[PDB]
Amino acid sequence: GAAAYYVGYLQPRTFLLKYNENGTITDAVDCALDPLSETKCTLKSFTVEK
Amino acid sequence: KFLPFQQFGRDIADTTDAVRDPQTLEILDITPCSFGGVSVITPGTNTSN
Numbered sequence A: 001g002a003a004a005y006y007v008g009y010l011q012p013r014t015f016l017l018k019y020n021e022n023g024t025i026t027d028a029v030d031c032a033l034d035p036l037s038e039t040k041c042t043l044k045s046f047t048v049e050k
Numbered sequence B: 001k002f003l004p005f006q007q008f009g010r011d012i013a014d015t016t017d018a019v020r021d022p023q024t025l026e027i028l029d030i031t032p033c034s035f036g037g038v039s040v041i042t043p044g045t046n047t048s049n
């Protein structure tokens, strides 16, 4: 027959895992993508002021 | 609200919210009762006891 598949590797990393009221994962941000992602994670908040 | 793969409860102080009650799935909320205070209002051992 005919089909297809993906192959990809995973590496260790830490994100900021956000759970809503129900208890389901909805928002995640890593630490090794962008300075914002970084400074955002340290403040432990999704909103960063000036 | 809780989910089948979420039978342990702890927000910031590791409170005993994890009582999923394996016996009869029943998540319980643990909370200490009133602590209380104390203070003695006295007019002095000179006037009266």
Ligand SMILES: *[C@@H]1O[C@H](CO)[C@@H](O)[C@H](O)[C@H]1NC(C)=O
Pocket: A021, A022, A023, B001
């Ligand atoms: C989680 O929230 C409510 C829980 O009251 C549930 O009915 C709903 O299907 C779930 N998802 C969202 C997005 O609310």
Ligand SMILES: *[C@@H]1O[C@H](CO)[C@@H](O)[C@H](O)[C@H]1NC(C)=O
Pocket: B046, B047
């Ligand atoms: C005790 O008596 C009064 C109580 O109000 C107090 O003002 C006084 O200074 C005291 N005197 C003595 C001798 O203990």
